[PDB]
Amino acid sequence: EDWKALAADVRSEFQWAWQGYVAKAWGKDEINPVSGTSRSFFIEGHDLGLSLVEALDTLWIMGLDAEFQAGVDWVKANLSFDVDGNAQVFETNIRLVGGLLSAHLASGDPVLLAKARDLADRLAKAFEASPHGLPWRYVNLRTGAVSDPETNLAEIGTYLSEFGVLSQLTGERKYFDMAKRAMRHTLDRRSKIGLMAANIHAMTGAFTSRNASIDVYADSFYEYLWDAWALFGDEDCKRWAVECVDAQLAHQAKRYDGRLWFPMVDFETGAVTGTAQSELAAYYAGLLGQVGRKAQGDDYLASFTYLQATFGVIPESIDVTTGQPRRKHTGLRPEYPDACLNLWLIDRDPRYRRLAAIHYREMKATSRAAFGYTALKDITTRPMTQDDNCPGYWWSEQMKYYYLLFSDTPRIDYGQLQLSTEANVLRGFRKV
Ligand SMILES: O=C1NC[C@H](CO)[C@@H](O)[C@@H]1O
Ligand SMILES: O=C1NC[C@H](CO)[C@@H](O)[C@@H]1O
Ligand SMILES: [Ca+2]
Ligand SMILES: [Ca+2]
Ligand code: NA
């Protein structure tokens, strides 16, 4: 395989998709690339240029400089967060705060930092509304009013990378501290077997379920422990990352039909409490490698490789007891090449490139639409039927992962590269 040629194809396809966004959805949150229309993501009828923001670091890394600058210039002229509407704190941080930060780090443009910080200050109100510092799920961007305290580990614990970078750049430790305090809350309440339930109440500070998970509602909490060690040298986070993964390997790792899975378990007793695994769990194969459990990470990756070989597109959810789909639609999901990149950064094994190339080519074969790339309706029909949405994360995640895996671009210091859970580059840009 000529990896450089494949990288050039990824770049060409990304530029083509960008052109569709400009033509049909300029300044809007998401393109619906089958109909050639747009939709809002955070606040209905008050778009915040989501996909444009998500795309920026990807554009820069690919050397799509005119496109990058057009997006940055749109942000500088147009993007405001003084909006009387409710935004989901978690999504707003990982997509918009993180997307502005990566664009700031690539370009050096102070305005992008000013806007990231303005947004983080609006989100901070959600943390301040809890006596525990656990953020409420929604906040009014203008007024600070909060709603829905019945939250989860991912939505209380996927801030430290973006907030910590804000603290580094601004000099104000308050961001780092607020994010770390929320994670410490649940870690301090681990069971005797070292697990946390995934569901937590922001006001009582108590768990609201008994289910420990590595999967949706928890996932990126575990990443951000490791990532805070990597980015900030935080010794507590290093310890916690390893402890949490050790507990998961002891109590959640189970084999079904010869394949490794991590079903949900009772956080105190370790009894299996669910049989589903989502596609989104594939991130964990990469995290396992990062924390020094690479053999287990490769074993887990292999479970998803099997799903890809069997089903073409990895099912959005599977039953681990049968290895078959629980849902037929998809979200055009990036977690398989996420894992491939993260494991490849350890040893540079070309196997990961081969696996990611399958994934990219399958994306082209299934999700291509008139004006971009779309999520799927039914992976079981041939052809697979399509829905009509390009999720914002596509612009930050899988095209970037493919390009990083194939390009060996001089724009990134691969030894220093750090990616958020939304693939925002938070370290490793090499000035041109
Ligand atoms: O981002 C995704 N959907 C939202 C979940 C948190 O509620 C999160 O865990 C998942 O990765
Ligand atoms: O961590 C998150 N999970 C869900 C999305 C990707 O599927 C994206 O928002 C991010 O990766
Ligand atoms: Ca992620
Ligand atoms: Ca990660
Ligand atoms: Na991005």
Complete DSSP assignment for 376-409: EEETTSSSPEE-S---HHHHHTHHHHHHHHHH--
Q: How many angstroms is it from 221 CA to the middle of ligand 1?
A: 10
CA distance 295 to 289: 7
8 Å CB contact between 339 and 353: no
Mutation pick for ligand 1 pocket among 217, 287, 330, 396 (CB with most ligand atoms within 8 Å): 217
CA distance 296 to 302: 10
Q: Is the dihedral of CA 256, 260, 265, 267 positive or negative?
A: positive
Kind of pairing, strands 265-266 and 385-386? unpaired
> Residue 432, exposed/middle/buried by CB under 10 A (0-12, 13-18, 19+)?
exposed
Tokens 């009509």 -> residue: 388
> Domain span at residue 175?
1-432
Domain of residue 346, CATH code: 1.50.10.10
Residue 134's H or E segment, with its range, is none
Helix 335-347 to helix 294-311 angle, to the nearest 10 degrees? 140
Instruction: Give the distance, in angstroms, between the CA of residue 173 and the centroid of all CA atoms in the same chain.
Output: 24
As given in the structure block, the two tokens for residue 162 are: 């973006």
| Residues 6 or more apart whose Cβ sits within 8 Å of residue 11 | 62, 63, 64, 403, 407
Backbone region of residue 107 per phi and psi (left: phi > 0; alpha: psi in -120 to 50; beta: other values):
alpha
8 Å CB contact between 164 and 176: yes
Phi, psi of 368, deg, nearest 5: -70, 135
CA distance 319 to 264: 12
8 Å CB contact between 66 and 391: no
| Structural domains in the chain (count) | 1
Mutation pick for ligand 2 pocket among 217, 279, 421 (CB with most ligand atoms within 8 Å): 421
CA distance 7 to 357: 10
